[PDB]
Design a protein around this ligand. Structure first.
Ligand SMILES: CCCCCCCCCO[C@@H]1O[C@H](CO)[C@@H](O)[C@H](O)[C@H]1O
Ligand SMILES: CCCCCCCCCO[C@@H]1O[C@H](CO)[C@@H](O)[C@H](O)[C@H]1O
Ligand SMILES: CCCCCCCCCO[C@@H]1O[C@H](CO)[C@@H](O)[C@H](O)[C@H]1O
Ligand SMILES: CCCCCCCCCO[C@@H]1O[C@H](CO)[C@@H](O)[C@H](O)[C@H]1O
Length: 180
């Protein structure tokens, strides 16, 4: 059993971008992938999504991809690639929007998407057990530790608490709808 296409391509894309950031520096890559930071860039639509591909430290990308691999992998396998695509697109857009609104356009990473996946997998398992998807009891503990790390700034994740809550809301909302 291996990670599906969406789970896999996202991981490889983030690694490729991370390498580009080490070679060229974070700033040069953000210039091209960050959320629109000037009116001249408002119609470069990829920017409303590409911010999610950038990570700023080894720990940032390491833990984001571990969670994406586990949660996204599970969602794709049991519920399909389409499900993972939508959760990802909606959470990246909303968390990015909230982040930009209160803290500016300079940010990046999959943490908002991870909050969405944590909320989705956990809630789906609590309300729709036989759906096959659930968050392992022990992993609920480490997910909480990861959440706390970012919430109290013990671990730099680029995005702010409000943006992460927005991502979580998307996951919970979709899980609620799916267990309907
Ligand atoms: C604190 C970090 C969070 C815990 C990370 C646990 C990662 C477990 C990865 O498992 C892998 O998941 C793939 C996708 O579902 C399966 O295809 C594969 O067979 C399985 O080996
Ligand atoms: C949204 C990602 C973070 C997960 C949040 C988990 C909620 C707090 C954990 O309390 C709950 O306690 C129950 C009683 O033991 C367990 O059965 C259940 O599994 C567990 O969830
Ligand atoms: C820096 C933190 C690293 C934590 C590493 C924890 C390893 C134990 C987690 O095991 C994983 O549990 C999943 C749920 O049961 C399985 O789906 C998966 O196959 C299995 O690999
Ligand atoms: C719910 C708590 C949200 O927390 C706040 O979210 C804002 C938006 O991200 C940040 O600007 C701010 O620093 C942070 O305290």
């Amino acid at each position: 059993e291996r990670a599906g296409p969406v789970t896999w391509v996202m991981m490889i894309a983030c690694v490729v971008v991370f390498i580009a950031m080490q070679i060229l520096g974070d700033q040069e890559v953000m210039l091209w992938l960050a959320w629109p930071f000037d009116p001249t860039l408002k119609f470069e639509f990829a920017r409303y999504f590409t911010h999610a591909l950038m990570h700023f430290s080894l720990m940032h990308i390491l833990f984001n991809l571990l969670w994406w691999w586990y949660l996204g992998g599970a969602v794709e396998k049991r519920l399909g690639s389409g499900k993972l695509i939508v959760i990802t697109l909606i959470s990246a857009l909303l968390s990015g929007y909230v982040q930009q609104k209160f803290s500016g356009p300079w940010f990046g990473g999959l943490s908002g998407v991870v909050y969405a996946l944590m909320g989705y997998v956990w809630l789906r398992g609590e309300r729709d057990p036989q759906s096959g998807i659930y968050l392992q009891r022990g992993l609920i503990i480490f997910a909480l530790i990861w959440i706390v790390a970012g919430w109290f700034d013990l671990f730099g994740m680029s995005m702010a608490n409000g943006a992460h809550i927005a991502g979580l809301a998307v996951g919970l909302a979709m899980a609620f709808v799916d267990s309907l």
